[PDB]
Amino acid sequence: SSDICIVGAGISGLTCASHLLDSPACRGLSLRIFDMQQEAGGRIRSKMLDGKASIELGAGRYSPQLHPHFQSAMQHYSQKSEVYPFTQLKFKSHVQQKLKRAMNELSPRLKEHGKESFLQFVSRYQGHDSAVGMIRSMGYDALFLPDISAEMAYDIVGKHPEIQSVTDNDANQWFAAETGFAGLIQGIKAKVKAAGARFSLGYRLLSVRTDGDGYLLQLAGDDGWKLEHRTRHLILAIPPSAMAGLNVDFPEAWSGARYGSLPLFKGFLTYGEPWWLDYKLDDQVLIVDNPLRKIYFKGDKYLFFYTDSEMANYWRGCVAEGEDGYLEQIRTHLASALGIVRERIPQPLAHVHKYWAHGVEFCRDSDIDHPSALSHRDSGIIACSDAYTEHAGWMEGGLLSAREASRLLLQRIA
Amino acid sequence: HSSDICIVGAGISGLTCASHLLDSPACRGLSLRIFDMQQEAGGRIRSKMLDASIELGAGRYSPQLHPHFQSAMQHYSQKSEVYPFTQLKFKSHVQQKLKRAMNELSPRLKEHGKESFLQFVSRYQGHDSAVGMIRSMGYDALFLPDISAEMAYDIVGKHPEIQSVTDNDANQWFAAETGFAGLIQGIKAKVKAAGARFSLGYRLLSVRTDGDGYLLQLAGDDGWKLEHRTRHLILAIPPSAMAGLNVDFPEAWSGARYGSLPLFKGFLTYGEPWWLDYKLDDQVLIVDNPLRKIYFKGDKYLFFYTDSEMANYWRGCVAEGEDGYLEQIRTHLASALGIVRERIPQPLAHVHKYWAHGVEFCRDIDHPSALSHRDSGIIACSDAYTEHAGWMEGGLLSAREASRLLLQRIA
Ligand SMILES: Cc1cc2nc3c(=O)[nH]c(=O)nc-3n(C[C@H](O)[C@H](O)[C@H](O)COP(=O)(O)OP(=O)(O)OC[C@H]3O[C@@H](n4cnc5c(N)ncnc54)[C@H](O)[C@@H]3O)c2cc1C
Ligand SMILES: Cc1cc2nc3c(=O)[nH]c(=O)nc-3n(C[C@H](O)[C@H](O)[C@H](O)COP(=O)(O)OP(=O)(O)OC[C@H]3O[C@@H](n4cnc5c(N)ncnc54)[C@H](O)[C@@H]3O)c2cc1C
Ligand SMILES: N[C@@H](Cc1c[nH]c2ccccc12)C(=O)O
Ligand SMILES: N[C@@H](Cc1c[nH]c2ccccc12)C(=O)O
């Protein structure tokens, strides 16, 4: 039993708990937090790669200019930042050299045709083949999706560090966590534990039913243990996709809005030799047409690649087919990317990867205002997610959603 | 995604099927795929370093009961240590009487041995005495209605802490020096070297025949959906898992009835082996309180081991939270020893594992050691199908027969 229950211990749920426990109105209300994983953090997942480097399987970078709440959170929890270097393309293709002009040329036509898919928009003016070549040169395959509009594309381009120069956003600075954003999650978790929150990690919420004034939750432990939990006030700090399992009629009983999703994949590789130093690639990113798409060389420590949408599914299928083939593909694509023979790319030492079936979730384009958090029209359950915000796909959005979700719960309590 | 042979389940059963099959000339060069829903092989064998290596799952074997298992340890160069928990040094008055009382009941297994163990003992001793006597053996499965009297004597005679009650105290016991995970690693390494490919982290959801072959639907632990085509399939999973698939288990396979019960272990370490003061090093106490069987391993750690309704008890306790869980343990340790709680220190670290289907078994028949689906030819492999249900030996026996059956399909 609890007075307040939050399901989801990513940055959104944890920040809800933090706001609530900071409020005098929550004094003497017990708070229980559930998550289906054994550790908090959600799509923030730091890992030490073979004892050599702390890497981010999920969220990896932030900008003080774009993400002031997150900057403040990092400072509040005494977390060390370091410069994030991948904010320009040192080695542009001929296509990439023309991107800023190509995008600028098209931008006045957003007024007339900006709601259509970015692919169709670019094709309207350049034709299919040219559009394909131009779009692909930015490294984010979401830009090819029918449900990513030209408007949304210019927003994506302007907010991602590697290609922010394309829309003249070079001034935004970027940082990463020296020892991983999991440290921020741990900091928040320690604060809310100290204030009396109780954590029940490794339980998946299966269903919710009202029952008198409150709610009865059915959960399952990752070891099979079934648990029923009664609460008076409920925040579901989970993404839109997660809202479906449950029997809460999402989204029709909430916004009636539509939500998009796309998958993400990151693969990190260590090597015996920091072989890329010789090609002056340390702390640089290459954006390529081949399936690696965006290739990052971190100092002299490791490299990684990052894909989305169709290409994230491509990679996860390759992983399913076997480790040997997956590594061989990476080696082949590294060689093509650099213009050197395959045998001149070494075999790797230790490597790790992560596929996120719903890595990014977001509000589809609408003329109808969408609040930062939602409420179930009959039961008053609150929904909290980065996806509900203008910062969907960024930690800042979760912090924004959590402020509003806490606000709504506090109004329910009052 | 395809194979000649597919094994689902990388516990000791499935891994041993792969080993047998890859050893056979008939499987030279065949493509063999092994799936498991977990990210590491071993199943109910799970070793861990307790901040000493400990066994969260299977923990002991006997050369006398378990010749196939002993032979595997010997074959894979796995070293053993003496398992000291084979007698009760601090017997209660009821425990002192167990051997005589079980002796007296034994002839009556001919007449009423298919009744539950509780009903069988109650028939002759009355409910209260029966309860007191059955409880003193420390295995709460002995109270279950699915456990016959004949099954209960088999259980009592095969468990090291109580084997003396049925005059089996000649049977010797060992643990793995480096953990049974080393044996699993050994087997995995041998089958990988022989060309087996592993897909760990995938849950088999369903199967259909696909003319000549089988089409499996699997899901990755990260949500990725995978279909796999194979020509020969072994489901090396327990009956509970089989019943979750769409393969009409148990009706199309044996029509026998299977049971299951949960297990729980909890391990604790401390700043001193405080139990050395009570001469408890390398002893086991069997008590009426919820800990039930309490083990003190040399001067290194202690652990407790419960089953059936008491495993559920502890798992609920964990769900309520770590503080209450650990204070419950401290309280029950004091009561078992007959000392004040203050004399028991707080632990430095602890770990626990609940297994919702820790033991699966055939209730009761010429039950073969591995099963075939009557129409589809899919083969089922589990310790539960054998006369050593709930022991690694049983998995090795089932694997022998599963491999034999599959090699028969192949020819
Ligand atoms: C590869 C990748 C890269 C990223 N890059 C960046 C970046 O560089 N910068 C940036 O700012 N952001 C980045 N993001 C986004 C950032 O990760 C998200 O905006 C943010 O972490 C979302 O937080 P959240 O708490 O709303 O949701 P989540 O982090 O998804 O947390 C939701 C939680 O709910 C739990 N849950 C769901 N359903 C249930 C259920 N039924 N029962 C119990 N628990 C449940 C989940 O286990 C999860 O822990 C990235 C994300 C990914 C995947
Ligand atoms: C607490 C405990 C103590 C024990 N003590 C001992 C002992 O001291 N001595 C002894 O000999 N034995 C002991 N055992 C028993 C022993 O562990 C089992 O007899 C043996 O490990 C069973 O092996 P198996 O391969 O048949 O089954 P399992 O080890 O259960 O292996 C089955 C595998 O199938 C996988 N799986 C199941 N369903 C699916 C699916 N749908 N898709 C994909 N994968 C699937 C599971 O992940 C699992 O890895 C103990 C067991 C427990 C739980
Ligand atoms: N902002 C995250 C995720 C993200 C938001 N929108 C996206 C569109 C495509 C791919 C990823 C994203 C990143 O830096 O990666
Ligand atoms: N043989 C295993 C498990 C086991 C088999 N049958 C049982 C009945 C009850 C409890 C445990 C068991 C052990 O040593 O623990």
From Swiss-Prot, chain B:
Its cofactor is FAD; Mg(2+). It is an enzyme of class 1 (oxidoreductase). It holds the Pfam family Amino_oxidase. It catalyses: L-tryptophan + O2 = 2-iminio-3-(indol-3-yl)propanoate + H2O2; 7-chloro-L-tryptophan + O2 = 3-(7-chloroindol-3-yl)-2-iminopropanoate + H2O2. Changing W391Y: Retains 60% of wild-type activity. The enzyme generates the imine form of indole 3-pyruvate (IPA) from L-tryptophan (L-Trp), with concomitant two-electron reduction of O(2) to H(2)O(2). Its EC number is 1.4.3.23. Belongs to the flavin monoamine oxidase family. Pathway: Pigment biosynthesis; violacein biosynthesis. One of its GO terms (biological process) is antibiotic biosynthetic process. InterPro entries: Amino_oxidase, FAD/NAD-bd_sf, Zeta_carotene_desat/Oxidored. FAD binds at S13, D36, R44, R60, L204, M392. This is Flavin-dependent L-tryptophan oxidase VioA. Keywords: Antibiotic biosynthesis, FAD, Flavoprotein, Magnesium, Metal-binding, Oxidoreductase. Substrate binds at R60, H159, Y305. GO terms for molecular function: metal ion binding; oxidoreductase activity. The gene is vioA. Homodimer. Violacein production is used as a biosensor for the detection of quorum-sensing AHL production. Violacein possesses antibacterial, antiviral, antimicrobial, antileishmanial, trypanocidal and potential antitumoral activities. Signal peptide: none annotated. Induction: By N-acylhomoserine lactone (AHL). Gene3D superfamilies: FAD/NAD(P)-binding domain. Mg(2+) binds at G11, G14, A236. It comes from Chromobacterium violaceum (strain ATCC 12472 / DSM 30191 / JCM 1249 / CCUG 213 / NBRC 12614 / NCIMB 9131 / NCTC 9757 / MK). It comes from the Bacteria.
